[PDB]
Amino acid sequence: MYKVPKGLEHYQKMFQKEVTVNDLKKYLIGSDKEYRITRRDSYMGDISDPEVILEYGVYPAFIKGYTQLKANIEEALLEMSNSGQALDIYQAVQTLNAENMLLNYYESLPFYLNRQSILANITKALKDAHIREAMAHYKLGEFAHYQDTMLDMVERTIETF
Amino acid sequence: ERDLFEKKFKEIKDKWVTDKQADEFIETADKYADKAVQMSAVASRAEYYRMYVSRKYQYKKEFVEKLKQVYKESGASHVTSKKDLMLAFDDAKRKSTIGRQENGLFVTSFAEDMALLFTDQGKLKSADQIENIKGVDSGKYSDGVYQYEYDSELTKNIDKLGYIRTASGDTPGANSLNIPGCQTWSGKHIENSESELIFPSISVKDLKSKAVLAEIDAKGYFEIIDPTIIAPNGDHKKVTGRFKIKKMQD
């Protein structure tokens, strides 16, 4: 079962309030340097790492009472899921992945994202040629260093859902 | 000059780095400068600082070659958490690789982890102590301190292909606390520093995370022999030697 980990105590603070849908977007994406939430050995350092946001950000605040965060991340994921944008969709898919990776390790979580809608949106998005081409060729930042493509990565993760 | 270095660190400082880490980083900066000079990885402390600011880490071939000796003597190590180990097999974006696909895995020499992680009497240190030594968060090895190991021959035949890399500023998995000199930044206690190289990633395709840990709990290790590695150009290739995935014990 999940117990709040030591470390990264400043993250624990950032979510102890009512965070809007729109700010949870900035956070989960991390385009913006000031909403880029990662850990030392995250996979990529130049965009947000959802796992770190849930493990050290959203879940401790949630235990500590701030339950609004759930329905908000749900709306945040909804919008970014239906955005027609590669990184937006990529990182949404990465958030639901985070939950699964955390479930993996901790075996139980404080709450679970109800995702039928997000997952429907992801599914509609991925049957768009423009969107798939966007993803097939998205090479901004650290993505430039992988022959393996964003589309390849997202498709591999969906199979785990 | 150093002033320029202090200005870059604030510019690129990652959200996860605490005021305490940031203070120690700037504070002890010139000891890491001078360690760099003493290893003869750099001519001057100024050169170290320029290199941090510029993000392009170039080294003299003579130095890199002398470093790889200790690596070649007893092989290579990468200390990791159970949690992160699992992530390598189960995180689908990683394509079943220990490391960042074609970008490699950070490592040190095996002799260094052995000497540094162990008591002279031969006992493994506290999780609490090792966490400190590695400059990681308290509790990240609570449920074990695991290790990736490339043995001496695997390393030897890797070097033969020309697949050992140095870390530089645009290297995937590098951050504000990454540092010129083929050396890790291990906080205020500089003598807990160790060498850093980049070895190629091991393919663990089709491998099951749960299997590996069960197999490690049953014996103390799990091994790949003639591992498929991933070269920079990204081709999959088998290389003669041994790669163990240990949980460390006395």
Residue with tokens 């400190």: B132
* Residue B170 distance to chain A (closest CA, Å): 8
CATH architecture of structural domain A2-161: Alpha Horseshoe (1.25)
Residues B114 and B64 placed together within one structural domain of the fold: no
Alpha helices in chain A (DSSP H): 9-14, 21-29, 50-52, 59-63, 68-81, 86-106, 116-125, 129-136, 150-158
d(CA A16, CA A63): 10
Residues B115 and B52 placed together within one structural domain of the fold: no
Task: Tell me, in Å, the resolution of the deposited structure.
Answer: 2.8
CB atoms inside a 10 Å sphere around CB B236: 10
Q: Which long-range contacts (CB under 8 A, 24 or more apart) does B52-57 make?
A: B52/B5, B52/B8, B52/B9, B52/B179, B52/B180, B53/B4, B53/B5, B53/B7, B53/B8, B54/B169, B55/B168, B55/B169, B55/B170, B56/B168, B56/B169, B57/B166, B57/B167, B57/B168, B57/B169, B57/B180
Asked which of B32, B49, B75 is the last residue of a domain, the reply is B75
Contact B154, B75 (CB under 8 A): yes
d(CA B8, CA B232): 29
Residue with tokens 């290739």: B237
Chain A positions touching B102 (Cβ under 8 A) are 145-147
The CA dihedral of B159, B198, B72, B224, to the nearest 10 degrees, is -90
Amino acid B78 reads H
Buried b (16+ CB within 10 A) or exposed e, B117-138: beeeeeeebebeebbbbbbbbe
Tell me which method was used to determine the 3D structure: X-ray
Residue A110, phi-psi category: left (phi > 0), alpha (psi -120 to 50), beta (remainder): alpha
In this structure, what token pair is assigned to residue B185?
A: 């930044």
Asked which of B75, B108, B128 is the last residue of a domain, the reply is B75
Residues B61 and B81 placed together within one structural domain of the fold: no
Our count of domains for chain B comes to: 2
Residues B98 and B143 placed together within one structural domain of the fold: yes
- Is A104–B90 a contact, with Cβ atoms under 8 angstroms apart? yes
Decide: helix, strand or coil at residue B55: coil
Residues B91 and B107 placed together within one structural domain of the fold: yes
Count of A-B CB contacts under 8 Å: 81
Contact B74, B110 (CB under 8 A): yes
Residue B162, phi-psi category: left (phi > 0), alpha (psi -120 to 50), beta (remainder): left
- Is A40–B90 a contact, with Cβ atoms under 8 angstroms apart? no
In this structure, what token pair is assigned to residue B7?
A: 């200005």
Asked which of B75, B100, B135 is the last residue of a domain, the reply is B75
Contact A36, A48 (CB under 8 A): yes
Q: Which of A10, A142, A146 sits opposite B18 (nearest CB)?
A: A10
Q: Which residue of B has its CA nearest to A48?
A: B15
Residues B61 and B89 placed together within one structural domain of the fold: no
Which residues of B have a CB under 8 Å from any CB of A?
Answer: 14-16, 18, 82-84, 86-87, 90-95, 100-103, 136-140, 170, 172-175, 177, 234
d(CA B14, CA B170): 15
Contact residues for B139 (Cβ-Cβ < 8 A; gap 6+): A5, A6, A7, B127, B131
Residues B71 and B152 placed together within one structural domain of the fold: no
Which residues of A have a CB under 8 Å from any CB of B?
Answer: 5-11, 36-41, 43-45, 52, 94, 97, 101, 104-105, 142, 145-148, 152-153, 156-157, 159-160
Q: Name the residue range of residue B69's domain.
A: 1-75
Q: Any idea what DSSP says for residue B103? A: G
Residues B17 and B122 placed together within one structural domain of the fold: no
Q: Which residue of B has its CA nearest to A91?
A: B93
Buried b (16+ CB within 10 A) or exposed e, A99-126: bebbeebbeebbeebebeebbebbeebb
Discontinuities in chain A with C to N beyond 2.5 Å fall right after none
* Residue A66 distance to chain B (closest CA, Å): 22
* Residue B100 distance to chain A (closest CA, Å): 8
Nearest alpha carbon to residue B179 among B69, B24, B71, B73: B24
Residues B197 and B245 placed together within one structural domain of the fold: yes
Q: What is the CATH number of the domain that holds B33?
A: 1.10.10.1660
Q: Which of B16, B102, B177 sits opposite A147 (nearest CB)?
A: B102
Chain A positions touching B86 (Cβ under 8 A) are 101, 104-105
Discontinuities in chain B with C to N beyond 2.5 Å fall right after none
User: β-strand B76-80 against B105-109: which pairing, if any?
Assistant: antiparallel
- Is B177–A40 a contact, with Cβ atoms under 8 angstroms apart? yes
Q: Which of A41, A97, A105 sits opposite B173 (nearest CB)?
A: A41
